[PDB]
Amino acid sequence: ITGRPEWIWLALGTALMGLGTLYFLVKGMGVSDPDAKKFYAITTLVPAIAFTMYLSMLLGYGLTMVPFGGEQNPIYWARYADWLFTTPLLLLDLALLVDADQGTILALVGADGIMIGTGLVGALTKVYSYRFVWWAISTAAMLYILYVLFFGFTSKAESMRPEVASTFKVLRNVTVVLWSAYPVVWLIGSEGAGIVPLNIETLLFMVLDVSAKVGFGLILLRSRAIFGEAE
Amino acid sequence: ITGRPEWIWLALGTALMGLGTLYFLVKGMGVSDPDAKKFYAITTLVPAIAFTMYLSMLLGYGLTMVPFGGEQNPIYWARYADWLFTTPLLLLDLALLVDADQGTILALVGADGIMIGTGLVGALTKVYSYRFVWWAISTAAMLYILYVLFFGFTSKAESMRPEVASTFKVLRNVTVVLWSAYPVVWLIGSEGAGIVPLNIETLLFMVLDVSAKVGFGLILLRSRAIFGEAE
Amino acid sequence: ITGRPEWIWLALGTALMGLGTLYFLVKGMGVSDPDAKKFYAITTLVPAIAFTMYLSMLLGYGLTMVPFGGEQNPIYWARYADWLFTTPLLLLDLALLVDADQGTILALVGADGIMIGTGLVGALTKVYSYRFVWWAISTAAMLYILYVLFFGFTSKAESMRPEVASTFKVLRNVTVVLWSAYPVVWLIGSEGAGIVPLNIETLLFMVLDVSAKVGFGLILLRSRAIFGEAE
Ligand SMILES: CC(C)CCC[C@@H](C)CCC[C@@H](C)CCC[C@@H](C)CCOC[C@@H](CO)OCC[C@H](C)CCC[C@H](C)CCC[C@H](C)CCCC(C)C
Ligand SMILES: CC(C)CCC[C@@H](C)CCC[C@@H](C)CCC[C@@H](C)CCOC[C@@H](CO)OCC[C@H](C)CCC[C@H](C)CCC[C@H](C)CCCC(C)C
Ligand SMILES: CC(C)CCC[C@@H](C)CCC[C@@H](C)CCC[C@@H](C)CCOC[C@@H](CO)OCC[C@H](C)CCC[C@H](C)CCC[C@H](C)CCCC(C)C
Ligand SMILES: *C/C=C(C)/C=C/C=C(C)/C=C/C1=C(C)CCCC1(C)C
Ligand SMILES: *C/C=C(C)/C=C/C=C(C)/C=C/C1=C(C)CCCC1(C)C
Ligand SMILES: *C/C=C(C)/C=C/C=C(C)/C=C/C1=C(C)CCCC1(C)C
Ligand SMILES: CCCCCCCCCCCCCCC
Ligand SMILES: CCCCCCCCCCCCCCC
Ligand SMILES: CCCCCCCCCCCCCCC
Ligand SMILES: CCCCCCCCCCCCCCC
Ligand SMILES: CCCCCCCCCCCCCCC
Ligand SMILES: CCCCCCCCCCCCCCC
Ligand SMILES: CCCCCCCCCCCCCC
Ligand SMILES: CCCCCCCCCCCCCC
Ligand SMILES: CCCCCCCCCCCCC
Ligand SMILES: CCCCCCCCCCCCC
Ligand SMILES: CCCCCCCCCCCCC
Ligand SMILES: CCCCCCCCCCC
Ligand SMILES: CCCCCCCCCCC
Ligand SMILES: CCCCCCCCCCC
Ligand SMILES: CCCCCCCCCC
Ligand SMILES: CCCCCCCCCC
Ligand SMILES: CCCCCCCCCC
Ligand SMILES: CCCCCCCCC
Ligand SMILES: CCCCCCCCC
Ligand SMILES: CCCCCCCCC
Ligand SMILES: CCCCCCCC
Ligand SMILES: CCCCCCCC
Ligand SMILES: CCCCCCCC
Ligand SMILES: CCCCCCCC
Ligand SMILES: CCCCCCCC
Ligand SMILES: CCCCCCCC
Ligand SMILES: CCCCCCCC
């Protein structure tokens, strides 16, 4: 484990995702509202999945070597197995908050799968220049997601209860800022141009992951928007 | 790329799926009917997924070598990753058109997963004679799907609006004819008996894919069956 | 095939899953109740999936070698591909029986995916002591599932029709007893401590699989709880 300088950030990430999972699990014990139960189930699964994948990276299972640039490059593939399941769950939290229609939910989840799937292909591609073709396709899929979150959901939240509109607006802004950083870290990190070393890259993804999952969840599960209007 | 004679058909397929995706995306911009939005989302995702997998084959990522018959045989595995997601989406288009019940939808999607999954196992199997055992199981799963589309959905469409009944009947006939060709191309192509060479096999799958996805989508999204009855 | 002593139990399992699939398929022909159709579709898919994965193990495709303990250990990875899809389908049978809320269904299916996913990682892990870390995480996920089936569903079934309450109680008890045996067989078998040899381990999993899928299905599909109350 300790033979890799980035191990400290993988261990911290593992701990923070595990602690986040347990807090949400305990906090959700005393909840019977069927609407609130939906948000607790979605939001608790997110850091639980991330916990297992951070642990796999810490123990060395989620790491492979990819030859490109005449070098064997360490690629943590477990990140994409994490994101494949956690990013659509996070979008479902937002879509259920605004009572989005089914067709829009399917478009979001499908574009998200394309985003993560093409990012994985780009991470494992051995022809250096082709890695950035996949990065560009994946980034186009992300821009579609961000467009929908702004010019489809925002207008839908305003016609909703005030507390669900204000909570959505906050979580929307958090998501757009944090998610946009991921393609940048990829491009300048060891998967892309190799400007930033792997140990610093790992620290950046850990800050982003914890903020986008545990920070996101703390804002959502403390809001009254997750409960139905009741007397 | 150009070192493979089949590259021209992979490049054409990539272009036609990309163009198809963009047309459906633009055409769906001016749509607010929640029913129509469902069909546009399903139908636009189909060629978008196929685009990415054709590109992976063009660039050489979606290709592996499988030893059988005393030879290293080029097997494009990316086809099955495509079909795993696009064939159930196409069946969902048909099932939603006739307002099929949930139990029937699950049976269709499950049989479809078995069809594609066993076809993938057959494509990667190293014992030559066993490849055709998997082909037979996969073909049995397809025949179940075709039976349901005829002796379960057809009777359901007649009790529906006339425009949804006539549109379903057309898309049903297109699907049964085109899908039935796939097991035949597999059997006589490089995955099976090896009668037809890979470059011709690739041309045939490209014609079938574009017809079953973009041609299918053009018929559906030009129909009024996708809109609810409104004044 | 016959070069492996466990082949006899893989062949028996294949036959019993295939026969089970055909019986459920025939029995479900004469069913039009939309509620009953749901249970028949879920319950017939379970042994059909298991059939294909037992066949892959029989023919040698679903087997790999994992080095640990200074030895190349035969690991049947196809079991986890089976369980990944069949265990959530079995939980869906139970959840639909008691009309569970959506949030609870998602929590069950998500915990089940974590259970199977971490068990697969543990089966393929090359550092011997780490294999049991994954076993423990997977077992914690199972205990969560069992808790929900007892202290969330049981109370919900009592407020239901008497026949659905008594049928659920029976299937609940069958599930908790049979599922609990799996982590024990893993721990003492070739994936874990290696006390029980592989051929005996394979026999035990076959008895458990057939009971948990075909036996489970025979109890459910003979009950009147799967039909709506009708005159
Ligand atoms: C509606 C939305 C959900 C739609 C989703 C969008 C999606 C279509 C976007 C594209 C996804 C696609 C790129 C997934 C590729 C997975 C692949 C990286 C797995 C590893 O295989 C890659 C190479 C080794 O580098 O295999 C070496 C050769 C091996 C012999 C490969 C044989 C196994 C194949 C991988 C079998 C295909 C399985 C499916 C891809 C499983 C789904 C994986 C997940 C990442 C989507
Ligand atoms: C309700 C419906 C959706 C049900 C679906 C029906 C489905 C059950 C039908 C059978 C599907 C099954 C054959 C999928 C097999 C995937 C497999 C080809 C992936 C590549 O692995 C094959 C060998 C190399 O040749 O791995 C070499 C050895 C490696 C060490 C393998 C270890 C990884 C395992 C593959 C882990 C299992 C992952 C799941 C199979 C992922 C789903 C893939 C998709 C193709 C279903
Ligand atoms: C809501 C719920 C459904 C959530 C589900 C819970 C889930 C997150 C729990 C953890 C699942 C995770 C451990 C799955 C790992 C699959 C992995 C074993 C496949 C084989 O790859 C392992 C190594 C060889 O030993 O690959 C060698 C290196 C290769 C180069 C690997 C590159 C391919 C990657 C495997 C791509 C990721 C694909 C996804 C993991 C596909 C889903 C598989 C299924 C088992 C979940
Ligand atoms: C909890 C994890 C989250 C919210 C991860 C989000 C990840 C992304 C938005 C990743 C995007 C990428 C691109 C847009 C292209 C480059 C490759 C990716 C996958 C890093
Ligand atoms: C857009 C792609 C489509 C509609 C693909 C359809 C593919 C099939 C219907 C494939 C069927 C197969 C068999 C029936 C057995 C032989 C292997 C397959 C997977 C080619
Ligand atoms: C039809 C198959 C069924 C119902 C299989 C159930 C399997 C389990 C409940 C497996 C559980 C495991 C653990 C709890 C940890 C050890 C590894 C597993 C996956 C065997
Ligand atoms: C979206 C965030 C990207 C900003 C990356 C900042 C990295 C600064 C760290 C110093 C770079 C290390 C280079 C010298 C080793
Ligand atoms: C009462 C609110 C705080 C509860 C404690 C939460 C502990 C989980 C770890 C959170 C750290 C990361 C927060 C986002 C920066
Ligand atoms: C379902 C369509 C299958 C028909 C295949 C027709 C192939 C004819 C092309 C000529 C065969 C090439 C053999 C000589 C190289
Ligand atoms: C107005 C209808 C035609 C629009 C142009 C569609 C261009 C997408 C490519 C379609 C070619 C394949 C059609 C099926 C044979
Ligand atoms: C949950 C069931 C686990 C019980 C396992 C009993 C196995 C007894 C078979 C004899 C053990 C073989 C050891 C000598 C070869
Ligand atoms: C009339 C009920 C029996 C029908 C025959 C079922 C045959 C399928 C194989 C069942 C054997 C396994 C039963 C569970 C132990
Ligand atoms: C194995 C991959 C299957 C999933 C394909 C994605 C489409 C799923 C459609 C689900 C239809 C709704 C069923 C109720
Ligand atoms: C990782 C594979 C999980 C999918 C298994 C297929 C069954 C899914 C059941 C979904 C139940 C409906 C939830 C609302
Ligand atoms: C185009 C939709 C408007 C909202 C999206 C904001 C774009 C942020 C740019 C992200 C940069 C990634 C490289
Ligand atoms: C048996 C259901 C009737 C409709 C299915 C038509 C069968 C077409 C044969 C396809 C040939 C594939 C080898
Ligand atoms: C803790 C929830 C109560 C019901 C679960 C029964 C636990 C059975 C123990 C299984 C042993 C697996 C190692
Ligand atoms: C080795 C660098 C080659 C540059 C390729 C950049 C491709 C980016 C595509 C974005 C449209
Ligand atoms: C090398 C050819 C061996 C023939 C096997 C055919 C199997 C087909 C099974 C269809 C029932
Ligand atoms: C080689 C045996 C090492 C023992 C590790 C046991 C780990 C079990 C963790 C359960 C909390
Ligand atoms: C609940 C605390 C979980 C912390 C265990 C993971 C941290 C790795 C320490 C080496
Ligand atoms: C929108 C046009 C997309 C065409 C790019 C793919 C074709 C491959 C050319 C080499
Ligand atoms: C319907 C009977 C299915 C039996 C075939 C599988 C058994 C393997 C025999 C070698
Ligand atoms: C993106 C930063 C999240 C901050 C988490 C703190 C929330 C406390 C209510
Ligand atoms: C299967 C052939 C499809 C033909 C596509 C043309 C549709 C234009 C309306
Ligand atoms: C767990 C044992 C199941 C027994 C199956 C027999 C059911 C006949 C109704
Ligand atoms: C009005 C809410 C502002 C939230 C933005 C937070 C950016 C990290
Ligand atoms: C909408 C604000 C985008 C912020 C992008 C930050 C990328 C590091
Ligand atoms: C009555 C519609 C006929 C459609 C069949 C088209 C076959 C390619
Ligand atoms: C229902 C007509 C089937 C046509 C099969 C064509 C196979 C090449
Ligand atoms: C295995 C075939 C079953 C025969 C019919 C059983 C009575 C519905
Ligand atoms: C009251 C029903 C008892 C069922 C338990 C069966 C254990 C195999
Ligand atoms: C609730 C009874 C548990 C039985 C466990 C059996 C494990 C072999």
C35 to chain B: closest CA residue: B103
Secondary structure class of C77 (helix, strand, coil): coil
CA C46/CA C93 separation, integer angstroms: 11
Nearest residue CA, atom 1 of ligand 10?
B218
> In terms of Cα–Cα distance, which of B44, B152, C153, C35 is closest to A114?
B44
Nearest residue CA, atom 8 of ligand 30?
B181
C18 to chain B: closest CA residue: B137
Q: Are B139 and B192 in contact (CB under 8 A)?
A: no
Rounded to whole angstroms, what are the CA distances from A13 to A6, A208, B19, B85, C29?
11, 10, 42, 32, 52
- Can you say whether the dihedral through the CA atoms of A106, A107, A109, A113 is positive or negative? positive
Q: Are B63 and A130 in contact (CB under 8 A)?
A: no
End-to-end CA distance of chain A: 54
Nearest residue CA, atom 19 of ligand 4?
A119
Phi, psi of C29 (to 5 degrees): -60, -50
| Contact list, B52 vs chain A (CB under 8 Å) | 114, 117-118, 121, 137
C106 lies in which domain range?
1-231
| Contact list, A85 vs chain C (CB under 8 Å) | 113
CA C169/CA C139 separation, integer angstroms: 23
Pairing of strands B63-68, A71-76: unpaired
Phi, psi of A51 (to 5 degrees): -55, -50
CA–centroid distance for A101 within its chain = 22
> In terms of Cα–Cα distance, which of A62, A179, A76 is closest to A124?
A76
How many CB atoms sit inside 10 A of residue A166's CB?
Answer: 14
The domain spanning residue C178 has which CATH number? 1.20.1070.10
> In terms of Cα–Cα distance, which of C41, C42, C52, C43 is closest to C17?
C52
For residue A112, count CB atoms less than 10 angstroms from its CB and return exposed for 0-12, middle for 13-18, buried for 19 or more: buried
CA C106/CA C116 separation, integer angstroms: 15
Pairing of strands B63-68, B71-76: antiparallel
CA–centroid distance for C221 within its chain = 17
Note whether C38 contacts B118, CB cutoff 8 Å. no
Secondary structure class of B67 (helix, strand, coil): strand
Helix (H), strand (E) at residue C24: helix C7-27
C55, two tokens = 């066949």
CA A62/CA A55 separation, integer angstroms: 9
Rounded to whole angstroms, what are the CA distances from B73 to B120, B123, B169, B195?
15, 10, 40, 14
CA C36/CA C23 separation, integer angstroms: 16
Phi, psi of C171 (to 5 degrees): -70, -35
| Total domain count, chain B | 1
Secondary structure class of C136 (helix, strand, coil): helix
C79, two tokens = 């079991």
| Residue where the block lists tokens 């019993």 | C16
DSSP secondary structure string for all residues of A143-204 = HHHHHHHHTTSHHHHHTS-HHHHHHHHHHHHHHHHHHHHHHHHHHHSTTTT--S-HHHHHHH
C59 Cβ below 6 A of ligand 23: no
Q: Are B192 and B136 in contact (CB under 8 A)?
A: no
- Can you say whether the dihedral through the CA atoms of A68, A69, A72, A76 is positive or negative? negative
C22 Cβ below 6 A of ligand 31: yes
Under DSSP, the state recorded for A125 is -
CA C150/CA C169 separation, integer angstroms: 9
Q: Are B177 and B210 in contact (CB under 8 A)?
A: no
Experimental method: X-ray
Pocket test for ligand 5, best of B82, B120, B182 (most atoms within 8 A of CB): B182
| Residue where the block lists tokens 């989620």 | A62
> In terms of Cα–Cα distance, which of A179, A216, A229, A228 is closest to A93?
A216
Q: Which residues contact C118 (CB under 8 A, 6 or more apart)?
A: A52, C134, C137, C138, C141
A179: number of CA atoms within 13 Å, CB side?
A: 26
For residue A227, count CB atoms less than 10 angstroms from its CB and return exposed for 0-12, middle for 13-18, buried for 19 or more: middle
Helices (H), C125-161: 128-150, 154-158
> In terms of Cα–Cα distance, which of A53, A17, A51, A9 is closest to A216?
A17
Under DSSP, the state recorded for C214 is I
How many CB atoms sit inside 10 A of residue A18's CB?
Answer: 17
How many CB atoms sit inside 10 A of residue C9's CB?
Answer: 21
Rounded to whole angstroms, what are the CA distances from A82 to A26, A143, A175, A216, C58?
23, 21, 17, 16, 32
Interface test with A, best of B53, B61, B96 (most A CBs within 10 A): B61
- Can you say whether the dihedral through the CA atoms of C15, C17, C20, C22 is positive or negative? negative
Amino acid at the residue C62: G
End-to-end CA distance of chain B: 54
C59 to chain B: closest CA residue: B130
Note whether A102 contacts B38, CB cutoff 8 Å. yes
Secondary structure class of B65 (helix, strand, coil): strand
B32: number of CA atoms within 13 Å, CB side?
A: 3
State the distance from the centre of ligand 9 to the C-alpha of B46, rounded, in angstroms. 27
Interface of B with C in 184-203 (CB under 8 A): none
A75 DSSP β-pair partners: A64
> Longest Cα pair distance anywhere in chain B, in angstroms?
67
A183-186: Cβ within 8 A, 24+ apart: A183/A135, A183/A138, A183/A139, A183/A142, A186/A119, A186/A135
A214 Cβ below 6 A of ligand 8: yes
> In terms of Cα–Cα distance, which of C226, C214, C227, C224 is closest to C24?
C214
Phi, psi of B70 (to 5 degrees): 65, 30
B140 Cβ below 6 A of ligand 19: no
Interface test with B, best of A66, A99, A105, A114 (most B CBs within 10 A): A114
CA B177/CA B157 separation, integer angstroms: 19
CA–centroid distance for B226 within its chain = 20
* Of C34, C36, C52, Cβ closest to residue B114: C52
Q: Are A167 and A155 in contact (CB under 8 A)?
A: no
Q: Are B97 and B35 in contact (CB under 8 A)?
A: no
Secondary structure class of C228 (helix, strand, coil): coil
Pocket of ligand 29 (CB under 6 A): B 170, 173-174, 177
- Can you say whether the dihedral through the CA atoms of A37, A38, A40, A45 is positive or negative? positive
Resolution in angstroms comes to 2.1
Chains contacting chain A through 3 or more C-beta pairs under 8 A: B, C
B63 DSSP β-pair partners: B76
CA C86/CA C20 separation, integer angstroms: 14
How many CB atoms sit inside 10 A of residue B47's CB?
Answer: 27
A137 interfaces chain B, CB cutoff of 8 Å: yes
